[PDB]
Write a protein that binds this ligand. Sequence first.
Ligand SMILES: [Ca+2]
Length: 455
Amino acid sequence: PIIKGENLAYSMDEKVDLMKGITATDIEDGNITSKVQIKSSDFVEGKSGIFTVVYSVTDSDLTSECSRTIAVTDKETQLSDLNWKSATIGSGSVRKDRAVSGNQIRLLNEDNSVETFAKGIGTHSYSEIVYNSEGYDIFDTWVGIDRHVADKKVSSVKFKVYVDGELKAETDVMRIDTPKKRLVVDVRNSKEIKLVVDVADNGNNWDHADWADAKFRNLAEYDASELNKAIEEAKKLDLNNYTEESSEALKNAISKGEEALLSKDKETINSALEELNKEMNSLVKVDLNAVINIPDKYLLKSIQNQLNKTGDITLGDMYSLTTLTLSGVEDLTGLENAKNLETLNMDYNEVKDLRPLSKLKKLNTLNAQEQFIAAGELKPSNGKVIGDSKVYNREGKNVAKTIRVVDKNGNTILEQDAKDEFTINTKDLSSGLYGVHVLFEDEGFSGVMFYLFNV
Ligand SMILES: [Ca+2]
């Protein structure tokens, strides 16, 4: 059994396949790659680092083991975007982002297609290129014979990577038809990396070699594991069991945490985590048994008729209203607790203020037409009578339309536009009873607010 596996490198957003590149062949069994198991690993998902995984397989009639590292990195720096400390080359000159022949960097793929790279280092054996590697964690590159010498027959090189003078990785002898190979080297706490292209056989003849996509890769400067843990536990809670104010704050913190995950910014994540933890401990549970204060006895009777019960109406009772029919109601106070109310049938009632229903998010059917609010008697003073004529809709807007004054015979003695208040001259009025009609209309909300004043 020949179990094989090379070092890999992944980015922060990529899905890590722990079995990528693992093969197992045996002369007695054949391809036993499907029977490969993991013997040891320190890998953690959603975490930046360099993890070690050990692989073991058992054949029909014998076990073999192999080990490889898997790095999860973030920021990358192309070597061609940096300056080398020194560079030697057997023929021509080293070129950044181009092959040694000046053409694009081109290597061979496993399916015999050609891979064209925009970034990399084009050199020629024998070659030694040294870079400053201080502060970098992982070196990643593709290597192979450049496609410009695809007709030269004798092209052959070997790639080697030295870290502070120590050989850390190398390929076999690569020829024209050898598909490109990947090299992922740990360069942690190093000062120099040396990229070596040896001549293999036939000297350096036509040894066009590319360090394709050669780049440094660093571990992430952030960690989203703690924020991910707090969000998942927060999303497990039922927002209906908490007050609308506290559930809104937690919901906003969950959203801010989800935004922080996408930012991949350390302080944005930490700040969202602290806020999410604060709203997590600031949650206050509802009390479905607490009594709701309903000052209007007709509203209390209307809710009792809809729910079939006597005595106090609870918040749990209020949460259960999806439809409600009113009769003889003057004050909607208390209905702000029925957050699930969808339909309110209150035609021919005595309501002049829809503001208690302002925050009802599901109230799509409101039948509040032809109200009549007997607003009592106004006492004339200083030769005039003054009354209030503001009728509020759900948005808190005065929807009063027509102010008309009527005498005992039904004849309109005056009419004007409705404002917040009205002032009627009474010095010129004959002695008797007079009525004041405050006409108002809106989307589904209309009626008459009636006053009277004696003279
Ligand atoms: Ca050669």
